[PDB]
């Protein structure tokens, strides 16, 4: 028992044309976990720390996959949240 859960239950709240907000629910164990990870598609994307996302540079009119990935300042890395279909 090291690596942190994986955030579940993601969203989206605020997406412009070009600027999104993601939020999700905190991992269940903060022993040592500092920040998420958004990814998008299947590359790492964005970083966080909180409980929000900030993703720019993504073109209007296009399908986009993100999701979020917790993880600890040890080398332990959490799984992948659900996949949120958002339309810029």
Same mark, same amino acid.
């Given at each position: ?6 955030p579940?239950?993601?969203?989206? /709240?605020?997406?412009?044309? %070009? *600027? #999104?907000?993601? *939020?999700?629910?905190? *991992? ?5 976990? +500092? ?6 598609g /299947?590359?790492? !994307?964005? @970083?966080? @720390?909180?409980? /929000?996302? @900030? #993703?720019s ?5 296009? *399908?986009? +996959?993100? /999701? ?5 300042? !040890?080398? &332990?890395?959490? !799984?992948? %949240? &659900?996949?949120? %279909?958002?339309? @810029?």
């Open positions: 028992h090291m690596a942190p859960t994986a579940t239950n993601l969203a989206s /709240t605020a997406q412009t044309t %070009s *600027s #999104i907000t993601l *939020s999700w629910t905190a *991992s269940t164990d903060n022993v040592g976990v +500092t920040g998420y990870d958004v990814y998008n /299947t590359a790492l !994307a964005t @970083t966080v @720390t909180g409980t /929000t996302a @900030t #993703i540079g993504l073109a209007a009119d296009t *399908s986009y +996959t993100f /999701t979020v990935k917790a993880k600890d300042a !040890a080398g &332990n890395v959490s !799984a992948a %949240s &659900n996949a949120v %279909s958002v339309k @810029t």
